[PDB]
C-alpha cells in the first residue's frame, strides 16, 4: 500500500538543551522479537524471465509441425 507514517516524541530535561549532537536515547516500542522477515520485502514483476530463446527451437519445430498437421484431421477427415 506504500503507506508512510512519521511520529515524534521528546523526553529530556526541561533546560531546553539544543545545539550539541543528541545521542543515547534509543527506546522504541516492542511487542516481542522483531522477527527475521526483513521489511519492504516486495518486488515488482518485470517479466524479464526467458530472454532470447530459453527453448530448443528444433524440438519446438517438430512439436508444432505435428500439432498443426494432426489437429487438421480432428477438424474432419473429409478434407485431406
Amino acid at each position: 500500500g506504500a503507506m508512510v507514517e512519521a511520529r515524534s516524541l521528546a523526553v529530556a530535561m526541561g533546560d531546553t538543551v539544543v545545539e550539541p549532537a543528541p545521542l543515547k536515547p534509543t527506546s522504541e516500542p516492542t511487542s516481542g522479537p522483531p522477527g527475521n522477515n526483513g521489511g519492504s520485502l516486495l518486488s515488482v514483476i518485470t517479466e524479464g524471465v526467458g530472454e532470447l530463446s530459453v527453448i530448443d527451437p528444433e524440438v519446438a519445430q517438430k512439436a508444432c509441425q505435428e500439432v498443426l498437421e494432426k489437429v487438421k484431421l480432428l477438424h474432419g477427415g473429409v478434407a485431406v
Partner: protein
C-alpha cells in the same frame, strides 16, 4: 517455480505466425475464433514439446552415462 510460463512465451514466439496462418485458414476474418484455435495450438504444442524435449535431454543423459542405466 512457474518455469512453464517462460516456455509458453518462447514457444508462442516462434509459432505465432504459424498458428495465426492456420487459424486464418480455418476461420478467416473471425478474429475471436482464430484466437480460440491459437490457444488450443499453444498448449498442445507445449505438451508435445515437453514430452519430446524430455526424451532428448534424456538421450543426452543416457549417452553421458553409458552404464546400462
Amino acid at each position: 517455480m512457474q518455469q512453464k510460463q517462460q516456455i509458453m512465451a518462447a514457444l508462442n514466439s516462434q509459432t505465432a505466425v504459424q498458428f495465426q496462418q492456420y487459424a486464418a485458414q480455418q476461420y478467416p476474418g473471425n478474429y475471436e475464433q482464430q484466437q480460440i484455435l491459437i490457444r488450443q495450438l499453444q498448449e498442445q504444442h507445449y505438451q508435445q514439446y515437453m514430452q519430446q524435449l524430455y526424451q532428448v535431454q534424456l538421450a543426452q543423459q543416457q549417452a553421458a552415462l553409458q552404464k546400462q542405466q
